[PDB]
């Protein structure tokens, strides 16, 4: 018996995973026996790709170093997932400059709310798939004490999952601020839900416009949000908060994981670059009945779902509309892409409300 | 920040796991940073105890060496779970000699079937929580090649899960031979269902009285079964199969994980020693109405449940009765215990048939 690459090569028969279309035995052999400084192995980063037989990526970083040690695997997967982003391609520098935005205030008869979300890793520490209980507590500590140094409209409280009272959790559900133990194949099969809910928590400011999840999917999931259509205000707080949290973090010799090639690093390659999800809830009575509705959203580089997450109704024809991509444009640009797309959606809605053809508004 | 024991010591608050009751911080410090020859660590073997808050053991061996490297923790959990098995206690030598059984034919008006299960690990290869795809595949090869060398009443066929046709699948379901991806906490949280259904499979003899599961919970799960009450014949085929496969395994330089103290080793310490579960399906119409039924079964060192597995209603007053313990008695002795126990139960059943009280018998 040899416990070598041959003995260990996954059987990707009947697997619709991205990893399986790029991880041929030869690559596997090259990467087999490699380990990051935190001991992440090829087997670790590809585990999800083996367990799950359906359409998935299947690749996940155990740590920041995963992207370089298994560079050739991440690079191939990234290039498919992000529809053209090869090894020599690079993510634009981060742009959290809200003032650079054009028209970031929607008509609130149509746009009911806006949020912008991203994730951050804390450099020096393994992602959820590979982090020890100690590492994870260090993420929680770093983010939480850094948070304690925010003031003004970013003054808030930290709610540990581990000490959550039924009161507190009931309120957080009402704010739609709660996260649960993940049950998705990705997070489960990557052992990203270990020791739940030790060092997991929810922080937010008093106004309930800035929300922080620690050690759910990412070390830090940052969400800025408001009812109404002032996405520019939402982005302004977003970038102000991110930079402010970081500044506190540097008191503690800590920094977001970020490199020039991939922008902000996260465990799942899908979320690289900006990992930015800018969304609005927008009411589209007429346009959603339009035969080219789906065409329009895709053409606008947008994604669409109901108001309650995936596979939920568009209650009262209110759709959650977001940017589809995550790489290749900056954070500010993605917000602008959402602004432009959503404004067009509204232009078409109003056109139809007036009984007009939107044939000349549809993206050609 | 230091990734040391203090930073990593579990929070067992609100945890009912056996582990948390014994794995204090000092013990965790002493075990922190140690690993087995297979890279198995203390965090690994304790993982399920941390993930699961319910009442469970929460300790799982990543490999055979886990019992020696993490011995003080394992021994502690072993002592408690098995109700008095300390470090200086030793498992009886195995005994698979069915000829030494006494009255190993049950009255078939009462016993409807007999079954004897155990598990074996293939030494040199990690247990499901830590085995690599390669190790797991080697486990399958070793076992399947051994099974292929079996003949006579043990002549049989291997059905890889990976190649399972719907036709095969439904026939296996019909026979109650099939197994699926485990969804239970210990198996999921120990990472023991990785790469499913790779290197998993089901082997059974032509007469369907011998069933082997490969790489489900254990490397090899072995089940001897017959309709009727010839537990002797079931035990005879059981031990002969275990020994026969072991002999075939010498062709691959392989053997079962076993030592003098703990007997046959498997991942979950619950199943040490013999890891033997001998059981009957036995009809006890009147005794099942008796107010001491459960108390009698446990007094006989047995354990009772429905024929639908855990806490299903018993149809037609048919119960799966089996030995409760796994350590301190040899395989043969556990079958004799079952035999002695069931016979007592049938005696009580028949006393109740005749309208006699049985408090003089309980």
Q: Give φ, ψ of B118 to 5 degrees.
A: -150, 175
Q: Does A359 touch chain B (CB under 8 A)?
A: no
User: Are B186 and B59 spatial neighbours (Cβ–Cβ below 8 Å)?
Assistant: no
CATH at residue A299:
3.30.590.10
Q: What is the resolution of this structure in A?
A: 2.0
The reply to whether A67 and A173 lie within a common domain is no
Q: How many domains does chain A have?
A: 2
Q: Is B23 exposed, middle or buried (0-12, 13-18, 19+ CB in 10 A)?
A: buried
The reply to whether B58 and B189 lie within a common domain is no
Q: Which A-chain residues 182-211 have CB contacts (< 8 A) with chain B?
A: 188-189, 191, 194-196, 198
Q: Residue B55: which domain range?
A: 1-87
As a whole number of angstroms, the distance between CA A104 and CA A98 comes to: 9
As a whole number of angstroms, the distance between CA B315 and CA B354 comes to: 23
Residue B352, Ramachandran bin (φ over 0: left; ψ between -120 and 50: alpha; else beta): alpha
The reply to whether A201 and A270 lie within a common domain is yes
The reply to whether A206 and A328 lie within a common domain is yes
Q: Which B-chain residues 54-113 have CB contacts (< 8 A) with chain A?
A: none
Q: Scan for tokens 């109901």, then name that residue.
A: A306
Which residues in chain A are contacts of B133 at CB distance < 8 A? 7-10, 43, 50
As a whole number of angstroms, the distance between CA B117 and CA B122 comes to: 17
The reply to whether B287 and B160 lie within a common domain is yes
What the block records as the tokens of B30 is: 């002493």
What the block records as the tokens of B126 is: 């990690």
The reply to whether B121 and B57 lie within a common domain is no
Secondary structure of chain A in HEC code, one letter for each residue:
CCCCHHHHCCCCCCCCCHHHHHCCHHHHHHHCCCECCCCCEHHHHHHHHHHCCCCCCCCCCCCCCHHHHCHHHHHHHHHHHCCCCCCCCCCCCCCCCHHHCCCCECCCCCEEEEEEEEEECECCCCCCCCCCHHHHHHHHHHHHHHHCCCCHHHCEEEEEHHHCCHHHHHHHHHCCCCCCCCCCHHHHHCCCCCCCCCCCEEEEECCCCEEEEECCCCCEEEEEEEECCEHHHHHHHHHHHHHHHHHHHHCCCCCECEECCCEECCCCHHHCECCCEEEEEEECCCHHHCCCHHHHHHHCCEEEEECCECCCCCHHHEEEEEECCCCCCCHHHHHHHHHHHHHHHHHHHHHHHCCCCCCCCCCC
Which residue pairs from B79-88 have beta carbons closer than 8 angstroms and sit at least 24 positions apart in sequence? Answer: B80/B18, B80/B21, B80/B22, B81/B18, B81/B57, B81/B269, B81/B270, B82/B272, B82/B273, B82/B325, B82/B326, B82/B327, B82/B328, B83/B325, B85/B327, B85/B328
Give the method used.
X-ray
Q: Does A138 touch chain B (CB under 8 A)?
A: yes
* CA R_g for chain B: 21
User: Are B82 and B91 spatial neighbours (Cβ–Cβ below 8 Å)?
Assistant: no
User: Are A190 and A48 spatial neighbours (Cβ–Cβ below 8 Å)?
Assistant: yes
User: Are B323 and B277 spatial neighbours (Cβ–Cβ below 8 Å)?
Assistant: yes
How close B55 comes to chain A (CA, Å)?
Answer: 16
What the block records as the tokens of B291 is: 């107010």
Q: Looking at chain B, list the stretches that DSSP marks H as alpha helix, in order from N- to C-terminal side.
A: 5-8, 18-22, 25-31, 42-51, 66-69, 71-81, 133-148, 166-175, 185-189, 231-249, 293-299, 331-353
By CA distance, what is A190's nearest residue in B?
Answer: B191
Report the DSSP beta bridge partners of residue A128.
none
Q: Scan for tokens 């796991």, then name that residue.
A: B17
Count CB atoms within 10 A of the CB of residue B272: 23
The reply to whether A186 and A146 lie within a common domain is yes
The reply to whether B117 and B168 lie within a common domain is yes
The reply to whether A140 and A232 lie within a common domain is yes
**Residue ending a domain, choose from A43, A68, A87:** A87
**Residue ending a domain, choose from A87, A120, A140:** A87
Candidates B150, B37, B97, B96; CA nearest to B263 is B96
What the block records as the tokens of A132 is: 């020890």
The reply to whether B191 and B280 lie within a common domain is yes
Query: Annotation-wise, does A278 bind a ligand?
Result: yes
What the block records as the tokens of A12 is: 């990707």
What the block records as the tokens of B75 is: 């021994």
CA dihedral sign, ordered B208, B209, B212, B213: positive
**Residue ending a domain, choose from B57, B87, B117:** B87
CATH at residue B59:
1.10.135.10
The reply to whether B61 and B176 lie within a common domain is no
Residue B327: C-alpha distances to residues A343, B101, B217 (Å): 73, 19, 19
As a whole number of angstroms, the distance between CA B36 and CA B257 comes to: 15
Q: Give φ, ψ of B38 to 5 degrees.
A: -105, 10
The reply to whether A147 and A229 lie within a common domain is yes
Look at strands A210-214 and A201-205 and give their pairing: antiparallel
As a whole number of angstroms, the distance between CA B127 and CA B268 comes to: 10
What the block records as the tokens of A283 is: 């009411």
Which residues in chain B are contacts of A132 at CB distance < 8 A? 3, 7-8, 43
Contact A7 B134 (CB under 8 A): yes
As a whole number of angstroms, the distance between CA B275 and CA B218 comes to: 11
User: Are A250 and A307 spatial neighbours (Cβ–Cβ below 8 Å)?
Assistant: no
B7 vs A1, A9, A137: nearest CB: A137
Task: Return the axis-axis angle of helices B71-81 and B42-51, rounded to nearest 10°.
Answer: 40
Report the DSSP beta bridge partners of residue B115.
B225, B279
């Amino acid at each position: 018996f040899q416990n070598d690459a041959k003995a260990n090569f996954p059987d990707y028969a009947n697997h619709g995973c991205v990893v399986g279309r790029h991880l041929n035995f030869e690559m596997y052999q090259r990467l087999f026996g490699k380990k990051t400084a935190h001991g992440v192995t090829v087997d670790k980063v590809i585990q999800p790709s083996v367990d799950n037989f359906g359409n998935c990526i299947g690749l996940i970083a155990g740590d920041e170093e995963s992207y370089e040690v298994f560079k050739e695997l991440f690079d191939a997967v990234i290039n498919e997932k992000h529809k053209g982003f090869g090894p020599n391609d690079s993510q634009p520098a981060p742009d959290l400059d809200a003032s650079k935005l054009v028209g970031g205030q929607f008509d609130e008869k149509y746009v009911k709310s806006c949020r912008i979300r991203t994730g951050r890793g804390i450099r020096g520490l393994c992602y959820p798939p590979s982090c020890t209980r100690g590492e994870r507590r260090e993420v929680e500590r770093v983010i939480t004490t850094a948070l304690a140094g925010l003031s003004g409209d970013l003054s808030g409280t930290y709610y540990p999952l581990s000490k959550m009272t039924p009161e507190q959790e009931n309120q957080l559900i009402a704010d739609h601020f709660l996260f649960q133990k993940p049950t998705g194949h990705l997070m489960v099969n990557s052992a990203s839900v270990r020791d739940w809910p030790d060092a997991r928590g929810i922080w937010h400011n008093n106004e309930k416009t800035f929300l922080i999840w620690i050690n759910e999917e990412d070390h830090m999931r940052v969400i800025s949000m408001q009812k109404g259509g002032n996405v520019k205000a939402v982005f302004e707080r977003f970038g102000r908060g991110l930079n402010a949290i970081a500044e506190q973090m540097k008191k503690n010799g800590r920094e977001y994981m970020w490199n020039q090639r991939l922008g902000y690093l996260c465990a799942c390659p899908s979320n690289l670059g900006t990992g930015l999800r800018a969304s609005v809830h927008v009411q589209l009575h007429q346009l959603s009945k339009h035969p080219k509705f789906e065409d329009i959203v895709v053409a606008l580089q947008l994604q669409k779902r109901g108001t309650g997450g995936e596979h939920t109704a568009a209650v009262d024809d209110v759709y959650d509309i977001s940017n589809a991509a995550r790489l290749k444009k900056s954070e500010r640009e993605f917000v602008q892409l959402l602004i432009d797309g959503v404004k067009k959606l509204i232009d078409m809605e109003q056109a139809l409300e007036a009984g007009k053809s939107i044939d000349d508004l549809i993206p050609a």
